[PDB]
Amino acid sequence: GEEDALNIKKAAIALRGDLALLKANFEANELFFISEDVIFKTYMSSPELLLTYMKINPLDQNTAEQQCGISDKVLVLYCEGKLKIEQEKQNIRERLETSLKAYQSNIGGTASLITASQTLVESLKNKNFIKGIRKLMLAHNKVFLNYLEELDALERSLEQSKRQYLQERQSSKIIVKLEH
Amino acid sequence: GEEDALNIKKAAIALRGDLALLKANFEANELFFISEDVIFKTYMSSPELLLTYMKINPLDQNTAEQQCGISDKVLVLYCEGKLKIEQEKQNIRERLETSLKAYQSNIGGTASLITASQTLVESLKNKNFIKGIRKLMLAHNKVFLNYLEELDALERSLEQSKRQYLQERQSSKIIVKLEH
Numbered sequence: 001g002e003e004d005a006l007n008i009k010k011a012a013i014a015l016r017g018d019l020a021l022l023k024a025n026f027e028a029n030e031l032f033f034i035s036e037d038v039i040f041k042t043y044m045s046s047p048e049l050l051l052t053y054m055k056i057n058p059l060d061q062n063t064a065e066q067q068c069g070i071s072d073k074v075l076v077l078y079c080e081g082k083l084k085i086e087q088e089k090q091n092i093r094e095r096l097e098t099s100l101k102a103y104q105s106n107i108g109g110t111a112s113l114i115t116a117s118q119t120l121v122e123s124l125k126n127k128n129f130i131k132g133i134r135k136l137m138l139a140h141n142k143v144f145l146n147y148l149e150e151l152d153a154l155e156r157s158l159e160q161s162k163r164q165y166l167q168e169r170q171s172s173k174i175i176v177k178l179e180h
Numbered sequence: 181g182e183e184d185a186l187n188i189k190k191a192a193i194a195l196r197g198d199l200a201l202l203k204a205n206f207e208a209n210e211l212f213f214i215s216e217d218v219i220f221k222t223y224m225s226s227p228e229l230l231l232t233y234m235k236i237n238p239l240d241q242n243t244a245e246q247q248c249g250i251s252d253k254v255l256v257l258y259c260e261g262k263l264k265i266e267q268e269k270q271n272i273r274e275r276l277e278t279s280l281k282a283y284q285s286n287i288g289g290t291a292s293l294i295t296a297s298q299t300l301v302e303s304l305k306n307k308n309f310i311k312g313i314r315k316l317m318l319a320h321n322k323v324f325l326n327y328l329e330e331l332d333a334l335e336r337s338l339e340q341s342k343r344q345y346l347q348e349r350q351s352s353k354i355i356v357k358l359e360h
Contacts, residue, residue, distance in 0.1 A: 022313065026316060026317075026320065029320045029323075029324075033323055036327060040327070040330055044330070044331070044334060046334075046337070047334070047337050047338040047340075047341040048341075050334070050338065051338075051341075072349075074345060074349075075342075078338065078341075078342045078345070081338055082335065082338060082339075085331055085334060085335050085338070088331055089328060089331050092324055092327050092328055092331070093328070095324065096321070096324040096325075099317075099320060099321075099324070100321075103317050107313070107314075107317075110310075110313070111310050114306055114309060114310060115306050118302055118305070118306050119299075119302065122298055122299065122302045125298070126294055126295050126298050129294060130290075130291050130294060133202065133287070133290070134287075136206060137206075137279075137283050137287075140206065140209045140279060141276070141279075141280075143209075143213055144209075144272055144275065144276040144279070145276075147216060147220070147272050148269060148272055148273070150220055150224070151224070151265055151268055151269050151272070154224060154226075154227070154230070154265060155262065155265050157226070157227050158227040158230065158231075158258065158261055158262060158265070159262075160227075161227040161228075161231075161258075162255075162258045165254060165258070169252075169254075
């Protein structure tokens with residue numbers, strides 16, 4: 001009763017938090033996948049488009065001469081292209097790792113809470129349905145028993161009516177004898 | 181899988197039979213209660229209306245002189261009235277007993293089958309929901325891993341493009357030297 005409804009309330013709210021966290025993780029991934037697919041269809045789709053992109057969007061002058069200080073300007077593009085790929089792999093690893101960690105942080109509690117709350121809800125529905133059948137049978141039993149009691153009462157009233165009739169009859173016979 | 185869906189099918193059909201039997205018992209009671217309430221509002225509602233009814237609707241000539249062979253014709257009405265009440269109590273006892281027996285014949289199997297089938301259905305819903313979450317996480321993991329693999333491939337293509345560029349450069353320098 002009180003306990004079961006209270007346990008359903010605690011579990012529901014904890015479970016809502018868990019699912020909200022799992023969902024935000026999935027959604028953050030989907031948002032990343034949309035922007036990242038674009039990249040893979042454009043400047044990360046071939047060495048040619050990467051090199052073209054790196055000519056227009058160079059890396060900072062600092063890192064440039066720092067990492068790819070090369071005489072041949074074409075080789076600089078290749079070098080910067082490689083660094084751009086390496087930075088992207090790191091970006092992707094970090095997001096993957098964040099996703100794994102966020103999922104792992106909530107999945108156990110989620111699976112447990114789902115199982116417990118759904119079983120508790122189901123338990124209460126079954127009990128209530130079975131209880132409703134038994135309650136209806138009890139009510140039918142009372143109706144039958146009430147008829148038997150109404151018949152016992154009627155029988156006692158009939159018997160009392162008969163004893164009164166006999167007193168009236170006795171009286172009637174006395175009177176008619178007197179009127180003769 | 182196969183077993184669970186087969187057990188759900190066997191239990192459903194047995195349970196449908198059980199509930200159909202319980203219901204027919206309740207309905208047969210309700211039908212009786214409707215006609216019987218009428219009786220209790222009319223000729224079984226008072227000794228007066230019972231006696232009036234028994235004058236118009238006498239018991240068979242056989243049982244009459246057999247049970248209530250009485251000189252006083254009014255006393256015959258009382259006697260027949262009592263027998264009519266006794267027959268009604270028996271009618272009601274027999275129906276009550278039939279109801280109890282029919283309910284008792286099915287209630288145990290019903291309560292058990294409800295609990296088992298509902299728990300099995302609930303178990304399959306929870307498993308499927310949890311499985312759907314894990315499957316989506318797996319799919320997200322594959323997307324991330326596929327990006328890493330597309331980046332490794334792009335990097336190898338970039339490196340091959342660079343080795344070709346260097347062969348073209350080597351060739352270009354040889355040619356320009358010759359054109360001098």
